[PDB]
């Protein structure tokens, strides 16, 4: 994340860290046994046994005291996902339950994030938070150690699909957030991570409305980050989550 600061330990209980082989991705706990991430992180289709999910983590790849490590029972990429356009860039991870039949062991540092309403009409007005362990700048040598978070405004599709910004590239199922003047954005290694935005309707007032997907550069002017519109896939999430 560029233009962001370190996030406090209790700030992000829903964020998930995904490890396998030499790769890394983030994700969001949407239910005690379910993690929502980006499909392009798994386009290589690595075996589930290889996969490791760590919840309640603050420092990337560091063991910690409320850290919980879980195996992945199975995962599902969206059927219509394109590795070229990154359309439908979302995937479900089914966590492996233990002997007690529990997956995630909920605590103040490990909690699921509320799914979005979707029925609400989002103005540019909506403010969001983006989080990740990715690069802090485009040229950055290494991923961040501490979790970085940044405040970004939601951006309308009509403005987004504009020629000046992203133009034709934006497709249904996609949403944008950030400042056209740039400065604050998601960055490579942030993929799969959460975009939590304000929902005044909701009782929790904050819902997962985006999955970090793609973009051009970090924080470049007129090039806001592109996310998967979680609200667009509620039926799909309901359908395969229920499994």
């Amino acid at each position: 994340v560029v233009g962001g600061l370190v996030a406090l330990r209790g700030a992000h209980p829903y964020i998930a860290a995904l490890y396998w082989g030499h790769s890394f991705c983030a994700g969001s706990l949407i239910a005690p046994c379910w993690v929502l991430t980006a499909a392009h992180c798994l386009q290589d289709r690595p075996a589930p046994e290889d996969l490791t999910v760590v919840l309640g983590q603050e420092r990337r790849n560091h063991s910690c005291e409320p850290c919980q490590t879980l195996a992945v029972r199975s995962y599902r990429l969206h059927e219509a996902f394109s590795p070229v356009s990154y359309q439908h860039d979302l995937a479900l991870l089914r966590l492996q339950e233990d002997a007690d039949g529990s997956c995630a062991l909920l605590s103040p540092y490990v909690q699921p994030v509320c799914l979005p309403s979707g029925a609400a009409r989002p103005s540019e007005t909506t403010l969001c938070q983006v989080a990740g362990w990715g690069h802090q700048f485009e040229g950055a040598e290494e991923y961040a150690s501490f979790l970085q978070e940044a405040q970004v405004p939601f951006l309308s599709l009509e403005r987004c699909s504009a020629p000046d910004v992203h133009g034709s590239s934006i497709l249904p199922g996609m949403l944008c957030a950030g400042f056209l003047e740039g400065g604050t954005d998601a960055c490579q290694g942030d993929s799969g991570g959460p975009l939590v935005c304000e929902d005044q309707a909701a009782e929790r007032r904050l819902t997962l409305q985006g999955i970090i997907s793609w973009g051009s550069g970090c924080g470049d002017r007129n090039k806001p980050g592109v996310y998967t519109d979680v609200a667009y896939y509620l039926a799909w999430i309901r359908e395969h989550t229920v499994s």
């Binding site: 509320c114 799914l115 009782e203 929790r204």
Partner: peptide, 9 residues
């Protein structure tokens, strides 16, 4: 206490 609803208010 208990869990807090994710439902719209």
């Amino acid at each position: 206490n208990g869990p807090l609803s994710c439902g719209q208010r």
